[PDB]
Design a protein around this ligand. Structure first.
Ligand SMILES: Nc1ncnc2c1ncn2[C@@H]1O[C@H](CSCC[C@H](N)C(=O)O)[C@@H](O)[C@H]1O
Ligand SMILES: Nc1ncnc2c1ncn2[C@@H]1O[C@H](CSCC[C@H](N)C(=O)O)[C@@H](O)[C@H]1O
Lengths: 373, 391
């Protein structure tokens, strides 16, 4: 069953947003098909590759339906998969977020019996959270494409975070972007939020020379020629909530829950106690052999090795004789919980020379995690 | 334009152990004076330590039972800010995206900026990002609402069944601390029942953190959610995807008003199997495929074309903040230190604008063949890749 499809992202910022696993793939893939937004990233991908690559953006044209371009983008990848190549597709940002050819190609490859998968990348939304500094999770956060919201007659909910993508291409199905229908989005915004509500125009920095765009505009300004002009195909709008929904006290109770200056009294207490805090109980610290660390890095970054490990974990462990007997045992189980037990130990036991028991390792809970809300 | 001022950068580790770390983040791990981190797996933790300058602190040491979360968060922020104030290049790292469900990060950045420090958050791979990749849906096809289970309930929000929905923290409805419980999970199930009915299906998602983890992506009918064998699967890392039950129709009048062709009758395709799936190779797709080999663009397209000096510099500026700061302080002088640059590249760089970069780093193959370089005017004047359509 030779031939495979992996689709990954390059993120938004030139080079810096690429993930370690993606860089590894770029180095290993037989052929790379890419659609990226800047020459430095393009060059970086080419230079790190085995030198067999194709620019998917060559399928666009001024007056050509983008849908046709997308079907062609998927198809060139699938042709090589069918020919037995290990194919990598790279799309800027996250390759599954506002990207048609990626999901299409993966579905078709899978249908035809080939292995296919998508890796996450840094999206424009991810960039926006970091740049504008709001936490979705507070209020919740709605993502929508500007044309899609209009053609389906949706209403925006003014109690939540709203993010509107492709604001610069309203009603455009080709590659000519004149903002000819942008006014229709403005109308939606006016009706849902009123004329005085403020939105943010967001463009995350693509190149080192770029400056983040995060300008605030009252909705009443959006029909101004000088404002309108600034909205390109790169533009995203952030629309903060106008009125958060009130807390329902009955829900609070049912959930069993209890019924601003930087350094208030509470914070000053926390800070004063910092230097002296002693935990209720001994916390485990990381404690792993070089062999264990080397292997875990290898498994994260080398898919061929991960495949070998999954096929026969006990034999694979036996190729790394630097592992402690406990690490070998844990790895042989091929489960996450045992890893946590061997790679983290109490300082008191580390001092005792005491390694976790077979029972402690095999008993580990598969879960974990820590919440920071 | 600085010499020894502290700075704060907060970055993510992403979700999957090691592999989700971004290049700019790894670069900072290597270069930072001090790293404060809160990550979920030991392999990631060891990787951060081993790549560092060896000055690091585990932020999770401030957690403890009987100790309120908020006190921990303040302490977490404070340890970072102290080192910033002492003139250190400080990195904080949090699981996933450091701005999604993370209080200490926003607090630290706000205070740092107020006190006049350079303070920046870098994006990381979120649980949501992992979900789109693993479950294979695009938020854009129907729109996508993301929210926390407790918050949805506490504000009496209704779920919209015409869109994609993502619900965080299903495994600990109404309980933080550490006594992670599913006693109030039935309240979320009631919400789902009201909004979607009993037969609608949800997906239970856990993205793999360790190489040993397997992706959880099981489909359950809402009627199944109270079954003991089903409840038992939900943990603190669990997220639900609720696919649209009743997507809104394309309004032919709205299509008209938008100036789109009357052929636009369906939305963009979702491939998960939760919606009806058109044939992959219908007439429209077959036409595009048949046209592929002989496609010739109306105008000649530029290709990437830049000196080694230009590529070397652009990579350095992406990955080396100190160098970027130097470049910004005096772009012309900086460009003059890289004599491998073409005259055009030096001129473009001196302008310190993105538009000039695109001009010098891309060229028509015809112009390349005839050795024509862009003019000073073409460079000086700084006046699309969309990958989805509704049609
Ligand atoms: N630099 C940038 N800043 C802000 N939004 C951006 C952006 N680049 C792309 N976008 C958004 O993304 C849309 C293109 S669709 C492709 C999105 C990409 N796959 C991702 O994960 O982000 C744009 O119309 C805009 O809404
Ligand atoms: N491995 C995993 N797979 C799926 N969902 C996960 C996950 N880890 C965390 N989550 C989800 O994320 C919620 C908040 S914790 C993770 C926050 C992190 N900063 C991020 O960028 O995503 C959890 O309640 C859970 O719903």
């Amino acid at each position: 069953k030779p031939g495979s499809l992996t689709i990954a992202g390059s993120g938004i910022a030139s080079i810096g947003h690429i993930t370690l696993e993606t860089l590894a793939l770029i180095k290993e893939a037989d052929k790379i098909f890419y659609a990226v937004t800047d020459p430095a990233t393009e060059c970086y991908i080419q230079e790190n590759s085995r030198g067999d690559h194709f620019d998917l953006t060559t399928f666009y044209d001024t007056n050509k339906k983008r849908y046709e371009s997308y079907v062609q983008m998927s198809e060139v990848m699938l042709r090589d998969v069918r020919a037995g190549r290990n194919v990598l597709g790279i799309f800027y940002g996250h390759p599954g977020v506002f990207v048609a050819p990626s999901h299409r190609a993966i579905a078709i490859a899978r249908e035809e019996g080939f292995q296919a998968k998508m890796l996450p990348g840094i999206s424009a939304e991810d960039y926006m959270f970091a740049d504008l500094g709001f936490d979705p999770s507070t209020y919740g956060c709605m993502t929508q494409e500007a044309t899609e919201l209009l053609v389906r007659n949706k209403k925006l909910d003014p109690s939540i975070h709203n993010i509107i993508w492709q604001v610069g291409s309203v009603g455009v199905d080709t590659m000519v972007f004149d903002n000819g229908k942008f006014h229709l989005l403005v109308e939606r915004l006016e009706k849902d939020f009123g004329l005085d509500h403020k939105i943010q125009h967001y463009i995350g920095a693509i190149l080192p020379q770029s400056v983040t765009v995060k300008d605030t505009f009252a909705i009443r300004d959006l029909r101004k020629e000088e404002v309108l002009k600034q909205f390109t195909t790169t533009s995203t709008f952030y629309v903060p909530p106008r009125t958060p929904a009130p807390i329902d006290p009955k829900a609070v109770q049912a959930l069993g829950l209890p019924a601003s200056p930087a350094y208030g009294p509470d914070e000053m207490r926390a800070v004063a106690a910092l230097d002296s805090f002693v935990p209720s109980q001994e916390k485990a610290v990381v404690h792993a052999s070089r062999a264990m660390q080397s292997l875990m890095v290898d498994l994260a970054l080398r898919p061929a090795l991960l495949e070998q490990y999954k096929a026969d974990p006990v034999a694979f462990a036996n190729t790394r004789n630097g592992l402690t007997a406990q690490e070998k045992f844990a790895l042989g189980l091929k489960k996450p919980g045992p890893i946590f037990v061997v790679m983290r130990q109490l300082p008191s036991a580390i001092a005792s020379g005491q390694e976790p028991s077979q029972e402690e390792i095999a008993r580990a809970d598969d879960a974990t995690a820590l919440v920071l809300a």
